Design a binder for this molecule. Sequence first.
Ligand SMILES: CCCCCCCC/C=C/CCCCCCCC(=O)OC[C@H](O)CO
Ligand SMILES: CCCCCCCC/C=C/CCCCCCCC(=O)OC[C@H](O)CO
Ligand SMILES: CCCCCCCC/C=C\CCCCCCCC(=O)OC[C@H](O)CO
Ligand SMILES: CCCCCCCC/C=C\CCCCCCCC(=O)OC[C@H](O)CO
Lengths: 156, 155
Amino acid sequence: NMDWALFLTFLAACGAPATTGALLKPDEWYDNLNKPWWNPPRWVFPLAWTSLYFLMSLAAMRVAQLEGSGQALAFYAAQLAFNTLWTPVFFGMKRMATALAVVMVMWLFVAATMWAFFQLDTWAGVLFVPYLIWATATTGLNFEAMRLNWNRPEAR
Amino acid sequence: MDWALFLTFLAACGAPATTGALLKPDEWYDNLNKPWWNPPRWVFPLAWTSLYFLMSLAAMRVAQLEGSGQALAFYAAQLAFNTLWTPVFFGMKRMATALAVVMVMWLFVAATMWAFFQLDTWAGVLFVPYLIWATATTGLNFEAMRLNWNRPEAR
Ligand SMILES: CCCCCCCC/C=C/CCCCCCCC(=O)OC[C@H](O)CO
Ligand SMILES: CCCCCCCC/C=C/CCCCCCCC(=O)OC[C@H](O)CO
Ligand SMILES: CCCCCCCC/C=C\CCCCCCCC(=O)OC[C@H](O)CO
Ligand SMILES: CCCCCCCC/C=C\CCCCCCCC(=O)OC[C@H](O)CO
């Protein structure tokens, strides 16, 4: 069942997006943004991502042990990279429209991963379902951020 | 050659490539203190674009083989820290944090190369220029750190 080398490798890989969160805190810029009613409080985000880093690593560990797992892991690498990209674009460069491009691509690769993961191992795909829900929420949130604050210069 | 695989990896490379097209070296990079052996800015896009193709071809080869899990897990890891680095160095402009990131990148680039050799020799060979380049980047990043140690970028 449990391969600790794989798991600790995928976990370590989450250390890159985890770092973007830890270096780019929400400050006053993010405060004064018009946000949608359903916008979760600050503390929700670190919690959610921390869980998902563990859930997706565990997922990728199961899959990586199976044969024919190349396309799935290629989808996985892709998802992780655009996930690492999103926070430095939204909070770092503060380009909400661009970040929305990024997060939508993130979404497609999260989805492609989930699918490819289901076709090899049902629990692995199951482990990515809460990932796909949070990614959708995030995209919605990125979208409302862009639209409700369109006339500011950070919406580009 | 497996086109589905290759294009997937090349698309993954779109994430670090975006970082670099969006954070083009301007006045700040120009006025940074840099070693004599710092290359002209036009080298950087050429080198990375080459390596995106090379690393994706390498990943295509490996991912077609039985037992590639761990190798591909190294690959996801190096790719992620690759993507983290340019926003830390150029965006945030934090030279010492950038050094830490690039050193972690280099480790995973070396582990990937290593794991690639254990499966597919040409996949390993393809990761050799990537590793040479990662070493030079680490050197460049180290030098910029110490040469600007007394400026706010020593962060
Ligand atoms: C469906 C798509 C299939 C795949 C086809 C699309 C591939 C997207 C990326 C390819 C890399 C090509 C090189 C892009 C140019 C990068 C130049 C750049 O500025 O790099 C910055 C540097 O890498 C920062 O560290
Ligand atoms: C997004 C970009 C990130 C990557 C950027 C960091 C990597 C650059 C380090 C390469 C060292 C090259 C070795 C030295 C090459 C010969 C010396 C030379 O460049 O001299 C310049 C000449 O004076 C003028 O034409
Ligand atoms: C062989 C390799 C062995 C390596 C040994 C294992 C190292 C694992 C380290 C990272 C854990 C990452 C878990 C996440 C912890 C912090 C999450 C976080 O802070 O990120 C939230 C951010 O807001 C979102 O963008
Ligand atoms: C291949 C295995 C990779 C597995 C994952 C690797 C984990 C490395 C563990 C510790 C890194 C600690 C390095 C910390 C670097 C110092 C950061 C620094 O720059 O601190 C300055 C800051 O600005 C102060 O204000």
